[PDB]
Design an enzyme around this catalytic site. Sequence first.
Site, PDB file in Angstrom:
ATOM      1  CB  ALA A  27      -8.549 -13.523  24.992  1.00 59.40           C
ATOM      2  CG  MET A  30     -14.756 -15.415  35.067  1.00 58.99           C
ATOM      3  SD  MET A  30     -15.405 -14.364  36.385  1.00 58.99           S
ATOM      4  CE  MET A  30     -14.186 -13.117  36.399  1.00 58.99           C
ATOM      5  CB  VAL A  31     -14.162 -20.639  32.786  1.00 61.10           C
ATOM      6  CG1 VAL A  31     -14.699 -22.028  33.120  1.00 61.10           C
ATOM      7  CG2 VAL A  31     -14.105 -20.454  31.268  1.00 61.10           C
ATOM      8  CG  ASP A 141      -5.139 -19.437  20.608  1.00 57.18           C
ATOM      9  OD1 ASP A 141      -3.887 -19.340  20.530  1.00 57.18           O
ATOM     10  OD2 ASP A 141      -5.799 -18.924  21.519  1.00 57.18           O
TER      11      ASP A 141
HETATM   12  O1  4VB Z   1     -13.359 -21.723  25.484  1.00 54.59           O
HETATM   13  C1  4VB Z   1     -12.784 -22.014  26.543  1.00 54.59           C
HETATM   14  C2  4VB Z   1     -13.315 -22.855  27.568  1.00 54.59           C
HETATM   15  C3  4VB Z   1     -12.638 -23.083  28.765  1.00 54.59           C
HETATM   16  N1  4VB Z   1     -13.249 -23.838  29.799  1.00 54.59           N
HETATM   17  C4  4VB Z   1     -14.688 -24.131  29.874  1.00 54.59           C
HETATM   18  C5  4VB Z   1     -14.926 -25.620  29.714  1.00 54.59           C
HETATM   19  C6  4VB Z   1     -14.128 -26.263  30.798  1.00 54.59           C
HETATM   20  N2  4VB Z   1     -14.330 -27.449  31.461  1.00 54.59           N
HETATM   21  N3  4VB Z   1     -13.414 -27.617  32.446  1.00 54.59           N
HETATM   22  C7  4VB Z   1     -12.600 -26.561  32.432  1.00 54.59           C
HETATM   23  C8  4VB Z   1     -11.478 -26.414  33.386  1.00 54.59           C
HETATM   24  C9  4VB Z   1     -10.360 -25.637  33.105  1.00 54.59           C
HETATM   25  C10 4VB Z   1      -9.354 -25.554  34.046  1.00 54.59           C
HETATM   26  N4  4VB Z   1      -9.384 -26.181  35.226  1.00 54.59           N
HETATM   27  C11 4VB Z   1     -10.461 -26.927  35.483  1.00 54.59           C
HETATM   28  C12 4VB Z   1     -11.516 -27.082  34.605  1.00 54.59           C
HETATM   29  C13 4VB Z   1     -13.017 -25.677  31.380  1.00 54.59           C
HETATM   30  C14 4VB Z   1     -12.419 -24.408  30.862  1.00 54.59           C
HETATM   31  C15 4VB Z   1     -11.351 -22.485  28.926  1.00 54.59           C
HETATM   32  C16 4VB Z   1     -10.847 -21.720  27.936  1.00 54.59           C
HETATM   33  N5  4VB Z   1     -11.548 -21.483  26.800  1.00 54.59           N
END
Ligand code: 4VB
Length: 331
Positions: A27, A30-31, A141
């Site tokens: 939601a 995408m990361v 959350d």
């Molecule tokens: O708002 C947000 C931001 C999010 N991410 C961005 C910042 C970050 N740094 N490292 C990681 C990571 C997550 C998972 N496995 C490895 C690295 C994120 C995930 C995720 C959900 N919601």
Amino acid sequence: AGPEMVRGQVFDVGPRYTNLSYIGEGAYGMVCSAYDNVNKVRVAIKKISPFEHQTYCQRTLREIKILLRFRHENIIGINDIIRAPTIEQMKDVYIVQDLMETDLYKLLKTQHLSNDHICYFLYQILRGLKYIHSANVLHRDLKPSNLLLNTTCDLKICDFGLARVATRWYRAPEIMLNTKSIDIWSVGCILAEMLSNRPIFPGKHYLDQLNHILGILGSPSQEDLNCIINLKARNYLLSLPHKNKVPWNRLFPNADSKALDLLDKMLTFNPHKRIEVEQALAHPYLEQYYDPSDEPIAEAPFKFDMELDDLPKEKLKELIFEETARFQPGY
Ligand SMILES: O=c1cc(N2CCc3n[nH]c(-c4ccncc4)c3C2)cc[nH]1
């Protein structure tokens, strides 16, 4: 060449950010991870497309404003923001953040944690939460996938899209039956999950979520059900047969007794009787890590200048464009 493409999504983040690799989606958008050719490190980039919905615009603005104000070791920051040069072309926003190794959700799927590591991760969660709450902000959350970990077990709380000035598995009973206590309940659920590698209240739907809670806590008392409650939910709870309370040591037979004492205080049905963040840090379970001389608090309570819930999405888009202007090469 052109902008890089990941799992059907265009990630238009070059030239500074290249060598993109998918991390996840939900939601929040995408990361991906990417190579930053300026700082010579890999970073995380979150792509959001919120402009069609007033609610998604509110969430994007709140997260940006909060994360750029906050400064704490256990809270993710915002290092850069990429968006189009004009408001008309702006359809996506890319939030650049520190890249971590994994999140607690993934870690708990593959690893058994030692008592010392459960204690250490709980301490970091609460230390970050103490700062957030000291600013009069609720996260709303908290869950394992929003707790990021690096290779040296440093923990950071992320995802402030639902945060406000003070999966349903981590939602407090008062949220479902209708404050800062909602975050404490979520922390209690995460502690229980670290103790057993499985969610404590994995409801398949709202009624099933209530049944899982009462399945362990037992039937709520008159005092627990006297406050403001949804009529349908109150009638449902009254229509149920009596449920016995399950002692914590029966659910977690090998857990540290001090961990279960704190778990009991966080997973209290009545939010008025639930332990607060400062008292949770001061609990004997956290004695090895508790350091009040090294637990910063916010300089002042957080305040939004405008009534964000009332603003049309076109106005919110202008505010987002304005808030992100400082990151524009060259400003
Ligand atoms: O708002 C947000 C931001 C999010 N991410 C961005 C910042 C970050 N740094 N490292 C990681 C990571 C997550 C998972 N496995 C490895 C690295 C994120 C995930 C995720 C959900 N919601």
